[PDB]
Amino acid sequence: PMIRCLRLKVEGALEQIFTMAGLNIRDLLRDILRRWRDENYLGMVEGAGMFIEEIHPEGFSLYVHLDVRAVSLLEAIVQHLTEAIISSLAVEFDHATGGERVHLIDLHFEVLDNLLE
Amino acid sequence: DPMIRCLRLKVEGALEQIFTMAGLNIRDLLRDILRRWRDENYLGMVEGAGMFIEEIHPEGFSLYVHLDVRAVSLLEAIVQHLTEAIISSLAVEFDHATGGERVHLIDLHFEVLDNLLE
Numbered sequence: 001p002m003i004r005c006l007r008l009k010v011e012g013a014l015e016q017i018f019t020m021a022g023l024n025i026r027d028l029l030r031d032i033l034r035r036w037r038d039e040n041y042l043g044m045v046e047g048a049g050m051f052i053e054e055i056h057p058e059g060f061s062l063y064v065h066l067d068v069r070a071v072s073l074l075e076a077i078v079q080h081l082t083e084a085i086i087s088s089l090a091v092e093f094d095h096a097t098g099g100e101r102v103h104l105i106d107l108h109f110e111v112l113d114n115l116l117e
Numbered sequence: 118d119p120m121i122r123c124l125r126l127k128v129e130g131a132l133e134q135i136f137t138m139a140g141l142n143i144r145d146l147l148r149d150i151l152r153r154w155r156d157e158n159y160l161g162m163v164e165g166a167g168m169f170i171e172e173i174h175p176e177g178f179s180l181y182v183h184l185d186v187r188a189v190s191l192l193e194a195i196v197q198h199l200t201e202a203i204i205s206s207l208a209v210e211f212d213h214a215t216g217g218e219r220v221h222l223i224d225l226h227f228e229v230l231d232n233l234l235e
Contacts, residue, residue: 030234047121051233053125063181063183112167113170114169115152
């Protein structure tokens with residue numbers, strides 16, 4: 001396998017913004033990723049998992065486990081995943097608030113080291 | 118079908134400092150223990166795995182191992198193997214580096230993060 005992990009930080013204040021709009025951003029991310037996993041499985045990624053680790057006093061780290069079909073595909077994989085997350089959160093937020101905006105375009109993944117390479 | 122998990126092992130800052138004072142780099146030792154497991158073909162337990170380290174502030178770090186553990190009983194077997202392998206190997210390294218001193222390692226354990234996409 002060719003295994004990578006991505007990490008994205010969700011600010012505690014971002015999570016609260018979503019909460020106040022009546023949204024659970026963790027549940028939304030899970031839905032976005034499930035959908036993205038299903039819409040790519042057997043394609044560029046043979047497997048995908050999602051882990052959440054608390055940040056204290058608030059916020060969380062979102063980890064995405066990926067088994068990629070080839071290393072050179074990572075850039076396009078990360079690009080498409082990032083776009084799906086930002087666009088999908090933006091749509092939900094718009095709908096929950098009657099058209100308010102929230103700053104999301106800084107959401108971005110780091111490709112973590114894989115020391116078992 | 119896959120059972121993707123993340124195993125997280127916390128290393129206290131004081132434990133890291135204990136190894137540093139023995140002239141040992143515990144992060145590199147842990148890296149090498151996991152690479153030897155890999156180089157044994159993971160003893161067949163998994164087809165592959167990823168590994169990274171995150172800092173703890175102000176001191177210490179967590180080691181992360183993420184892989185398809187296949188099944189619950191196999192997960193338990195992987196965790197038991199890695200934990201024993203880490204504890205025994207670090208103890209040998211520490212013993213050698215210090216001329217036979219001991220260090221308390223039996224609290225080292227992995228917590229398991231669930232795949233939230235399941």
